RNA sequence: GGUUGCGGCCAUAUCUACCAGAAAGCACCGUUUCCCGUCCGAUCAACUGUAGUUAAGCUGGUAAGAGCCUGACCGAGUAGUGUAGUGGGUGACCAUACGCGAAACUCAGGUGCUGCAAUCU
């Protein structure tokens, strides 16, 4: 994945020259789906259509500070066999980028949400522990956190071996 | 501009209710010998433009009007749908991808225009 910017028009009518202009950080892995899901998102929110329109400008954004641990707060819609849902998961990923990828991943997995069901409606690094409202992230901003790695395995290369394994780490 | 004759598109011209109309024209309007037609000179026919009148017609104007039209990133890029998948879904159906794309709805504006001929403070 990459976080294009895709800015868009609509074209311009005799009348009604320089219109709008609109954006959105489309989390797409390339050029050209970034396009696609702009359009499907403008679809959604206006009257234009990538015939009646027009593209500005991708640009690619990138993260910052990309090797800081964020955690990233999402907003999704993402869409059931039953009906369309709200939520919001929270994300501890190096960058957006990597978060939403990994969140497509843990909606795939939790929900069967396939990337064609989920919104990403909104993305946030959370300033404050405490706004980090899940657990399940809540457990790593920990004062001093030590673990172990218990029940480490050896990927030997050979089919065989002779010593015998160990999972002592 | 008004009016008349014949008109074109055929409600932006229809309808409902209330006001205004100088000039001319229109009209209503008077008469029954003749041609003419009726149960009935009302209609139609003829005669006068004389006795009268804008009351009606006709025209124009008013209405948070009905209707009618036109438009809008108003609703809706919805509904629907052409193509694509070894996409989802027990299925019913649905989601996406490339496409086209309504109607009610909502708001805004409008409410005859116009041709030829003739005529009129």
Known sequence: ???YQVIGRRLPTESVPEPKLFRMRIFAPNDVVAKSRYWYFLQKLHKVKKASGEIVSLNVISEAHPTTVK???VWVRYDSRSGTHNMYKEIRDVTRVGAVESLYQDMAARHRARFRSIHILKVVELEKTADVKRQYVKQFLTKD??????HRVQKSTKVFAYKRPTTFY
């Not at 956190?145 to 218990?150: A, G, R, V």
């Open 145 to 150: 956190l030590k673990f172990p790695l218990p």
């Open 1 to 3: 994945f990459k976080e």
């Open 71 to 73: 955690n990233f707060g």
